[PDB]
Amino acid sequence: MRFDIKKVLELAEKDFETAWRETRALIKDKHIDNKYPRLKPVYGKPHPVMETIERLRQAYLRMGFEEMINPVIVDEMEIYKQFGPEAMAVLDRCFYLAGLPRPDVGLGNEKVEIIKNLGIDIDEEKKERLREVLHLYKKGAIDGDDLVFEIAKALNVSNEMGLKVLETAFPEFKDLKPESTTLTLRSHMTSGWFITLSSLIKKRKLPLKLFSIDRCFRREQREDRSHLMSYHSASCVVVGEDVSVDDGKVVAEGLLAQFGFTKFKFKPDEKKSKYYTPETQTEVYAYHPKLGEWIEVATFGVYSPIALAKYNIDVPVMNLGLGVERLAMIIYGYEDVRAMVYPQFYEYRLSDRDIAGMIRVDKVPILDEFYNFANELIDICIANKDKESPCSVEVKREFNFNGERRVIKVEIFENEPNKKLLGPSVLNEVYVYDGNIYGIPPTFEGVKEQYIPILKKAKEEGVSTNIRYIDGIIYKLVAKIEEALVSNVDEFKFRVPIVRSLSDINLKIDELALKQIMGENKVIDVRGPVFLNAKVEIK
Amino acid sequence: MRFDIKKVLELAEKDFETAWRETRALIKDKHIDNKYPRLKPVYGKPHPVMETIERLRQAYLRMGFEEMINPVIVDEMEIYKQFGPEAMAVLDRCFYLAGLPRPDVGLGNEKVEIIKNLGIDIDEEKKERLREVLHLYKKGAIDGDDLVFEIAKALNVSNEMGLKVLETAFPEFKDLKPESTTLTLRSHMTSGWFITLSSLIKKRKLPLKLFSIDRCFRREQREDRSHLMSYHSASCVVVGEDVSVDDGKVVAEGLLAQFGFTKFKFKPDEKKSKYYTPETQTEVYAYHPKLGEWIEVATFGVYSPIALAKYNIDVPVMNLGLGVERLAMIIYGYEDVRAMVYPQFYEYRLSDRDIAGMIRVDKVPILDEFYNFANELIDICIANKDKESPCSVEVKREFNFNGERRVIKVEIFENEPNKKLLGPSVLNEVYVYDGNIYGIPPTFEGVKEQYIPILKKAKEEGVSTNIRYIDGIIYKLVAKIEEALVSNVDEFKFRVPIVRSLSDINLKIDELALKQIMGENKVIDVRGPVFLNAKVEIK
């Protein structure tokens, strides 16, 4: 359990130094299962696009901007107001919203028969209750969520039978086709900004500095290295009598400065979109190092007095919109938005450490007694690994299991002469380097010489499992002692000659790590002569 | 063992609704150990003072202020520079810094003797090596950190014995007494601001808005509900040709506004500290609802041209300092800073939920087989709890343990007439309410009528363990079957007459929760007649 405070204090007062040294034994090492690097840290991991969104919220807030949420869904005529006649072309880029009608369907008599053939007992009453539920669904008074519930309730059947009725008796529901409206999703924040400002200016003291960082949707040819069907705009508007394009320049500098950028460039936007005053629509470029090229991070301009007029705004307004995903690409060094935004549809490679922590000890003794017995036994072997043969090393110990004592005589030996007790590889340690697994000896005596610079490099740069051959071997041995005791076996022999695989030293690897090791076509080279012979007797 | 995708898809494709209902069995319920509320959420918990510090950094950053770190340690003469002659009084509140000298000690034969008597073999060489280590320590070239190491290294002894030599041969080290200096800890940010500003003004374009939120130290008579020896100042300075107290007023308003405050008060500071221009030192008050009274959150003013002059600053400077702990007291509703700041030295009461999650099931079967057997058995009893006596309920089941079959006949009965199989309390459920534990029946027939409004209230407002008597009872029974098999026992009877304690239904409570249950003088009332007789035979 825990340790004796009194005994520790007394031992320490007799002689502090001995006590400090000796008292280390009161601190147990962890179960082999849970030693580093098999012990992994757990922490929450943010998404780059969303951390960039928060950092942008704060870059705007720290410039005095007031945070807003604008309408997402806007009528097409809003886009005609802002873009003018150009909207008959620009509206190609916007998603229209469409939706299913309600079905007008009735009950009886063929349907009544279907429902009866389902095993349902229907009154006239039940038939009317359901006739009403269907009416209400036609008239829009019941949600789709709720229709299985209401049917079930109507006929007094199970929920699932409600669904059964729905799909069996009324399959014409499947013939509903979505019909489009005049409503669209905003393709940039502006489509909302006008609506928000039109209502807001008259109520507020100018100048206004507003911002919103929120989703926008474009209907594009395809998705790109730098384009998605849905993106995030880090948009703002500055409203005031004296506003000009320079305000956009200053907002772009202030946003980018806070992210570390010292160099960006402005460049006229050939499009000259009509919601912007002529010759004010400006592109902002920042440098993407991994791509080598300059990338468009933002766009700004001053709204056209014509659009502003159509929204009852009589004062100039500067707009700036920065694409969150672009900035994020630069920040985190991604070269493909699709792979940055949705990394789940791509691959998750395991590092040397990841793999080193997926290498586990197979059989280990379950009982504390024998686990410690194992550790001690390991240290014993490591102490006599060089005994000159013929050798033997006995360990007799008594274990008490309630009433009965059993005495375990584990003996590990070497009959044949001119040998040593254990062999050149018993202390080999399993490393992982560059996707490879190597069981490496502490010194390269007798190692083939092409191999040595590789193993030296893995031993230097790679990640260790901190498991030696001897460790897994002995845990296997003592686990076999436990196994023996519950199996009514009094004697057995156990031997590890030349080690050829992970299995041979009682280790295994998580299948996910194997799949990669193979897939990347790398090696698991665990090998060595480890001639360990043991006999155990259980009296 | 996961579930069969192919079998599922096929079952679902035959008849979706049946399949949807039936496949619930493929979602295994959790081990009783890990069912809510014994399963607790785990998350990191911020400290109110530090969370308030961060929110304050952001309140300052969002006003355009530039964040700084100022010197913490300042010479007393700095305080005379700022406070003028008043510093001969004000310096009372400041901590002086002191430190103990290096000892001048030599070796020589009396000590050499001690070191030998310690068991250490000392050469002339070792003696000279240690003579140097002691020299270097006098001359300040060895850190205290490092001295036990160096001593050991000198004498070629263990680390711990380096320490032993240190404390045994040179105990005069203990006679070192601390000598004071002229250095003090800052008692407010101002003591740093001047220094910082003196260096910074010449290098920068005015106006400057700087802020720092960092520790300050005062020597108070004693610590208060609202005073600690060390506190955090959320200080700032506004530097510019046109600053006046009004800048302090807007900084105080802007800080407090962002925290939700719509209401604060200004009040002249009777002190008229001399580092502030006359009649500008202002106190800021905010309302502490729980205390009922108005509390001082901040202080501001304009530095005195005399103090500014002594720092080579020729332009007015407004300073404001808000005490973080005060603001935190208001925000989180604490009435005692010492208890808000250092809550570990106070008490941690366990909520009803806390205690309900510290009620554990004692014995539960280890083998999946018997665990499920147990659940099945529970449902069987709950199904036959009302069988009219004489009753009996057999459950014969055969279990396979590698080679051998064993057949377990669990029989649950009631020989005596005019009763039922189980009894009125068998489905009672354990609740926690207002620090109390109650085992409560689903209905209040036969309950003394004094009790009923209480138990009704606990059942409505309290927190349930979601364990019924029958649950713990049966887990105990089957656990005993397991014990039996391992113990070579083929028959036993098992009976639960009237329930009197938690133990009677195989439950126990965490020691920490009991300590409170007792300390707070509350009850653990679980009792009921649950007459369950069972016989178990193992063939």
Partner: peptide, 26 residues
């Protein structure tokens, strides 16, 4: 560890096997 739990359950079951066959041996 999920593997350990099952190993220990394995030890338990073979202990019961051995007990059963040691019974019907006698």
């Amino acid at each position: 560890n999920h593997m350990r739990v099952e190993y220990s359950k394995d030890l338990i079951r073979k202990g019961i096997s051995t007990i059963s066959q040691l019974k019907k041996a006698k």
